Amino acid sequence: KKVVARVAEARAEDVGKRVVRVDKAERAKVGVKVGDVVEVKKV
């Protein structure tokens, strides 16, 4: 269905874990900043 998540800053602890990278240009495209709620959906 969909995942409700938050944009975060990757920490040392996150290495090796699954993530979706969102760079600054992608963040400007969708209008998000660290801490914002986003929806992650399979294509």
Next chain:
Amino acid sequence: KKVVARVAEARAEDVGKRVVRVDKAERAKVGVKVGDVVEVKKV
């Protein structure tokens, strides 16, 4: 609008960068594995 991205494994280089964490249970909920295309949308 929306961001088209891929589930990845966070590397050492990703520390300090913005990401959306998707743990195994979230991955089972949406049906994704590392390498899969997902859409990231602002709420």
